[PDB]
């Protein structure tokens, strides 16, 4: 009846934690904006270990993988743009004339460029979009680069492709990634079907506003997610059941000219326009959009009561803030997105919705100031043919709720894919009473303590053990090693370093848990047990150090005599 403390190493118990994840991809490109050489190849085997008898609490709005992804996305963009020509001298005043077709959208500007060579000051002509040039004086023929007054504009290297490539996040040693497989998971709350993965599915890092593109579709129906949901100040992420095809075109061809800035470096701009001037535009099928709004309104009605639902467009302002944005083909498109959110549902202008679009070359990306990118002109017709997969809606009084296209920041897109993933820290050390004194990873996490220790080996085998990303990974590896050694030193001072299950000779105190072994090894899982005695963990460990050992080491010294 007298019970003794036993230490188990490799216990399938975890705590919520924030860490740095590894970057994996399908090796299959070169000169990609996402710098694929900084990511490792993925393992063709997806792993995917289903956790039986495990229900976990997921919260997409507190998911650290979203902040990590946003940081990595920004870092990769800055790394990709760093080795490119900076447009230091292109701050000179530009003498512009309108191009007569888009009436005044494209301006033909003459300007005088100085160089580092200083052989001569050269006069050049170039075409720019209305959104890139800002009138600097009352004179209606003086203009300057939009970003000149605040920063030096960095030109993107034409060799850099902006095509999104799937990115997988993989758990570092010492951590695990859980995935919620509930078909109707709402992004917040318990999930009854949870699996553990090594790497997430591929995430396309598509940069867009208001409408989510490509990504992934909902399995059963349109699902509308938010945090408080009653609060107006939350981003509403709508994941669609079926995608809507959007065909965006930039019909103008143009030509590309190089104006040398210095040795080995040049500014790439548009020369002469070939063909007619035609407005860039996007075509969305009207009937499919009808069905998308019908489904969204139905799902909104279920949570906001049977009120009138109205979709309004954004207010006037800078096109980078209030208009839809995307970058297919390596060109940067902004579209009005106002022929889509202009309807009242309560309770035919053709069969295709054609949205006007505008092209901008100087982009202040990632909601930052002081840095800007100049996108070199592409020389052909730009086709998109992308899949609209989910919306970002915001909410703003006579019995009507007003919804508008909108969003927070780019993290709202990552949540759209990352809502089902969670990162957890594994705590392999557990302590339990026993009678005697001195499947897959987490497969038994939901099982009772009995018959879950027979898989401790798995947690012990797996889980443990000049670029900036390289140094950050180095720090992560050092921290993982330090963590493993902290566990090994705890086993050392307890005399347990030589085996996974270490039996001690310190009695179990009924004040810690006044329960029979059947109440402990059966009935409870390891997580419930570790929670039950959490408040005494620091006390229990002290006795393991002070009992047996120290007293036992002293006893060991005198056995020779």
């Amino acid at each position: 009846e007298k019970l003794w403390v036993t230490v188990y190493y490799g216990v399938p118990v975890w705590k919520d934690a924030e860490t740095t994840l590894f970057c994996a991809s399908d090796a299959k490109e070169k000169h990609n904006v996402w710098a694929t050489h900084a990511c490792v190849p993925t393992d063709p085997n997806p792993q995917e270990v289903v956790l039986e008898n495990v229900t976990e609490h997921f919260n997409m709005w507190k998911n650290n993988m979203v902040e990590q992804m946003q940081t990595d996305i920004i870092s990769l963009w800055d790394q990709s743009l760093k080795p490119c020509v900076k447009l230091t001298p292109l701050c000179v005043t530009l003498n512009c004339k309108d191009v007569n077709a888009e009436r005044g959208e494209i301006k033909n500007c003459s300007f005088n460029i100085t160089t580092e060579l200083r052989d001569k000051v050269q006069k050049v002509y170039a075409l720019f979009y209305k959104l890139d040039v800002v009138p600097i004086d009352n004179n209606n023929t003086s203009y300057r680069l939009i970003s000149c007054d605040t920063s030096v504009i960095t030109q993107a290297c034409p060799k850099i492709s902006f095509e999104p490539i799937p990115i997988h996040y993989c758990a570092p040693a010492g951590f695990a990634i859980l995935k919620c497989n509930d078909k109707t998971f709402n992004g917040k709350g318990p999930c009854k079907n949870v699996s553990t993965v090594q790497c997430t599915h591929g995430i396309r890092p598509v940069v867009s506003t208001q409408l989510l593109l490509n990504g992934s579709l909902a399995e059963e129906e349109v699902v509308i997610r938010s945090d408080n949901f009653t609060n107006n100040a939350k981003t509403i992420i709508v994941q669609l059941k079926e995608s809507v095809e959007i065909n965006c075109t930039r019909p103008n061809n143009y030509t590309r000219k190089s104006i040398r800035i210095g040795p080995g470096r040049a500014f790439y701009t548009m020369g002469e326009i070939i063909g007619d001037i035609r407005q860039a535009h996007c075509n969305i099928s009207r009937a499919k959009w009808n069905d998308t709004l019908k489904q969204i309104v139905i799902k909104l009605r279920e949570q906001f009561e049977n009120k009138t639902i109205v979709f309004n467009h954004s207010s006037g302002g800078d096109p980078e803030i209030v208009m839809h944005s995307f970058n297919c083909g390596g060109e940067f498109f902004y579209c009005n997105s106002t022929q889509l959110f202009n309807s009242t549902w309560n309770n035919t202008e053709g069969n295709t919705i054609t949205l006007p679009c505008r092209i901008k070359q100087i982009i202040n990306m990632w909601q930052r100031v002081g840095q800007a990118m100049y996108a070199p002109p592409i020389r052909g017709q730009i086709r998109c043919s992308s899949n609209i997969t989910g919306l970002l809606l915001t909410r703003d009084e006579n019995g009507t709720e007003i919804f508008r296209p909108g969003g927070g920041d780019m993290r709202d897109n990552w949540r759209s894919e990352l809502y089902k993933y969670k990162v957890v820290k594994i705590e392999p050390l557990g302590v339990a009473p026993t009678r005697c004194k001195r499947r897959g990873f987490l497969g038994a996490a939901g099982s009772t303590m009995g018959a879950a220790s027979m898989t401790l080996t798995v947690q012990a085998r797996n889980l443990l053990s000049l670029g900036v990303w390289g140094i950050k990974q180095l720090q992560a590896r050092v921290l993982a090693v330090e963590r493993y050694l902290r566990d090994q030193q705890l086993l050392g001072i307890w005399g347990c370093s030589g085996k996974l299950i270490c039996t001690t000779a310190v009695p179990w105190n009924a004040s810690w848990s006044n329960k029979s072994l059947d109440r402990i090894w059966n009935n409870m899982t390891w997580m419930e047990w570790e929670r039950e005695i959490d408040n005494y963990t620091s006390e229990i460990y002290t006795l393991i150090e002070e009992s047996q050992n120290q007293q036992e080491k002293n006893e060991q010294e005198l056995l020779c005599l």
Partner: nanobody
Amino acid sequence: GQLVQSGAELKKPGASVKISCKTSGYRFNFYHINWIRQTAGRGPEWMGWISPYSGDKNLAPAFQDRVIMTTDTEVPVTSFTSTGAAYMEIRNLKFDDTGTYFCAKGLLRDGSSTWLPYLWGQGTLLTVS
């Protein structure tokens, strides 16, 4: 934990009844649901065990034809608690079947005694006449 049963019913001989048992305060899929008959004229006797996790059933030989057991899935409310329900359909009622039917939560998830009932409901009276 709490086990809640439907209210008392009066049935004619030859009729069938379906008795529900709703659960809360514990994980439904972790424990067995045990159906036991309290016979008005004989005393208690066992009717059957149903496992919501896998659907495994164990009926007493007397009731292998009389009892059909089904369950729904659990709906989690927290990480350690969920609600749910189980149903037992009894066919061909006779006057001898008048009595109180109880559902109970199984004692353990593992061990030799998992099957035993531990948390009992209030009991539903079935009258045949």
